[PDB]
Amino acid sequence: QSACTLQSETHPPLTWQKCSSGGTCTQQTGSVVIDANWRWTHATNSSTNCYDGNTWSSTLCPDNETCAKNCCLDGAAYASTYGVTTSGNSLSIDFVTQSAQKNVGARLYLMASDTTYQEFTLLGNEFSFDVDVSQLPCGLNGALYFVSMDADGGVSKYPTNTAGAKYGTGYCDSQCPRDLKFINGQANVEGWEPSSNNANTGIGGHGSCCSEMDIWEANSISEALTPHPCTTVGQEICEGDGCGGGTCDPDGCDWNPYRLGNTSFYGPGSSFTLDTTKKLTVVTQFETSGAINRYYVQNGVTFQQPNAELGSYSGNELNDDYCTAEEAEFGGSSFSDKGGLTQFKKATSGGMVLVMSLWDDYYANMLWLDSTYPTNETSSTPGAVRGSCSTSSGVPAQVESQSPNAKVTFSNIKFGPIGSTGNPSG
Numbered sequence: 001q002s003a004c005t006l007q008s009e010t011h012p013p014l015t016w017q018k019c020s021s022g023g024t025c026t027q028q029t030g031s032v033v034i035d036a037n038w039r040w041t042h043a044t045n046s047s048t049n050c051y052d053g054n055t056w057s058s059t060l061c062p063d064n065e066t067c068a069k070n071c072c073l074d075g076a077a078y079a080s081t082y083g084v085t086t087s088g089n090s091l092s093i094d095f096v097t098q099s100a101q102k103n104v105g106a107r108l109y110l111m112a113s114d115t116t117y118q119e120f121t122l123l124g125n126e127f128s129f130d131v132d133v134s135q136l137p138c139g140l141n142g143a144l145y146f147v148s149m150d151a152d153g154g155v156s157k158y159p160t161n162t163a164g165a166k167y168g169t170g171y172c173d174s175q176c177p178r179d180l181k182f183i184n185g186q187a188n189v190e191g192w193e194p195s196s197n198n199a200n201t202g203i204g205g206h207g208s209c210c211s212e213m214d215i216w217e218a219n220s221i222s223e224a225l226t227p228h229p230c231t232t233v234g235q236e237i238c239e240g241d242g243c244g245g246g247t248c249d250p251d252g253c254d255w256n257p258y259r260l261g262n263t264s265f266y267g268p269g270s271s272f273t274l275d276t277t278k279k280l281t282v283v284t285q286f287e288t289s290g291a292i293n294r295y296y297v298q299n300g301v302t303f304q305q306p307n308a309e310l311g312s313y314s315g316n317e318l319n320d321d322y323c324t325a326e327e328a329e330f331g332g333s334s335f336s337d338k339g340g341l342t343q344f345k346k347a348t349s350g351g352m353v354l355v356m357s358l359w360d361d362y363y364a365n366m367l368w369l370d371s372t373y374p375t376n377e378t379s380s381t382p383g384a385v386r387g388s389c390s391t392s393s394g395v396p397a398q399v400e401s402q403s404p405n406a407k408v409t410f411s412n413i414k415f416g417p418i419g420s421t422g423n424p425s426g
């Protein structure tokens with residue numbers, strides 16, 4: 001797809017800190033861009049929509065190639081249309097925003113310039129950020145994560161895509177998402193099927209796969225840390241059912257303190273170690289062995305990831321023994337079939353793009369994160385309970401109606417060698 005300018009594109013600025021092993025941190029200046037799927041896609045020569053609701057224009061988009069040629073992605077009014085705003089090193093995303101249309105959440109990427117994404121090499125380094133999840137009720141997910149996307153959004157590999165990173169193209173993750181309207185410089189209209197419950201989305205014949213590091217997926221009730229390996233490290237297209245776990249691990253080796261047994265660590269109020277009604281700091285370290293360490297800071301008090309005992313595993317580090325014990329006790333073979341932490345280390349050794357989003361779940365109502373899932377299981381089933389939310393929570397239409405003002409705020413992003421981000425920001 002190409003880019004149009006009926007609406008100017010001005011990326012909300014966002015500062016972050018780059019720290020060094022020497023003990024100092026210096027301020028960096030970037031910005032954020034919204035994913036192409038949220039944009040208005042219309043004819044290059046008019047305002048005629050190429051996509052509207054959950055259907056494509058059969059005239060402008062008879063096939064994937066013709067569609068990409070006839071259509072372009074336009075600019076976004078971040079605040080008024082998408083409820084996305086920034087201030088210094090802080091970024092906020094509102095749940096429901098009413099403009100000429102209703103918009104739900106957003107997915108944003110940190111940029112290095114107005115035409116390129118900022119790439120981060122996680123291995124040997126740590127990522128720190130502050131987050132306020134107080135306005136995130138059951139059913140919502142304020143997420144901060146990394147994915148192995150190309151810095152240019154896919155332009156060099158697929159010339160038919162001239163919009164690039166400036167317009168949020170090139171997404172990919174361990175779920176091999178088929179809801180993307182544009183992949184590899186072509187549309188995804190071929191084989192398109194409208195969602196049964198989301199008036200704005202559908203499923204195309206192709207998907208976009210790649211390694212995904214979910215540093216943070218959470219709301220005020222539950223939080224999870226989850227690495228997702230893929231047999232092909234970077235962005236790669238998939239077709240039909242091949243997208244269903246053919247190359248990527250959609251489940252991952254997840255670490256949810258609540259799911260692992262400590263139901264008093266993360267929650268609303270002073271009855272929890274970390275009070276989710278107030279802002280908190282989350283630091284994640286990627287040691288060279290491939291393991292992942294985590295600690296939190298709130299009101300000046302430091303807490304390492306809480307200890308967990310699962311099978312023969314005991315500790316607070318997300319390592320091979322933990323992931324192996326999890327599949328043995330909770331079930332599944334996806335993570336290990338795809339190479340585990342060894343394969344995932346190939347992703348963190350390379351460059352990954354920072355993603356920040358807010359979403360509700362049309363497939364499983366976010367029950368996998370904050371409730372008992374599947375809903376027919378009980379507390380007696382290992383790993384069934386992930387949070388205190390009712391198994392009846394998270395219905396999109398309901399949370400969108402009852403909590404339109406929900407929002408997540410990410411701030412004070414700091415990146416550098418392990419042990420360096422706790423030093424003074426520059």
Ligand SMILES: CO[C@@H]1O[C@H](CO)[C@@H](O[C@@H]2O[C@H](CO)[C@@H](S[C@@H]3O[C@H](CO)[C@@H](O[C@@H]4O[C@H](CO)[C@@H](O)[C@H](O)[C@H]4O)[C@H](O)[C@H]3O)[C@H](O)[C@H]2O)[C@H](O)[C@H]1O
Binds near residue numbers: 214254331369374
């Ligand atoms: C005896 O047979 C075995 O039984 C066990 C237990 O019943 C089976 O294991 C269970 O299988 C369930 C379905 O596969 C999963 S639910 C699964 O949970 C994961 C972890 O939360 C979810 O992954 C997350 O998905 C999010 C939304 O896409 C992502 O954003 C996030 O990054 C992912 O971590 C997934 O969506 C759910 O479907 C149980 O966890 C598991 O114990 C076993 O399969 C049988 O063989």
Ligand SMILES: *[C@@H]1O[C@H](CO)[C@@H](O)[C@H](O)[C@H]1NC(C)=O
Binds near residue numbers: 261262264
């Ligand atoms: C949860 O973790 C906190 C901090 O490590 C600890 O003080 C508390 O005892 C733990 N509770 C349980 C039930 O593990």
